[PDB]
Amino acid sequence: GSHMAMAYVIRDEWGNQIWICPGCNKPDDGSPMIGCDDCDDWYHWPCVGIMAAPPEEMQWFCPKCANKIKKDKKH
Ligand SMILES: [Zn+2]
Ligand SMILES: [Zn+2]
Numbered sequence: 670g671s672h673m674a675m676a677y678v679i680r681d682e683w684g685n686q687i688w689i690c691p692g693c694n695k696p697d698d699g700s701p702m703i704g705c706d707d708c709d710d711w712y713h714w715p716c717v718g719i720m721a722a723p724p725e726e727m728q729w730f731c732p733k734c735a736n737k738i739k740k741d742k743k744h
Pocket of ligand 2: 705706707708730731733734735
């Protein structure tokens with residue numbers, strides 16, 4: 670069973686998922702959020718360095734999944 674990943678998850682007033690971006694360790698405190706192409710969860714703009722909304726054709730990966738890209742990407 671998952672012992673971890675129980676946190677970084679808060680419920681909103683309406684019951685929405687408050688994502689705690691594992692990049693900064695902040696929840697949505699009122700920022701624009703961006704989701705990964707490999708993972709399901711959402712990160713924030715300042716954490717990853719988003720200047721403006723990136724293309725959808727582009728596959729965007731957080732510092733976590735960028736590390737999966739690693740160096741040697743085969744995609
Ligand atoms: Zn963040
Ligand atoms: Zn990711």
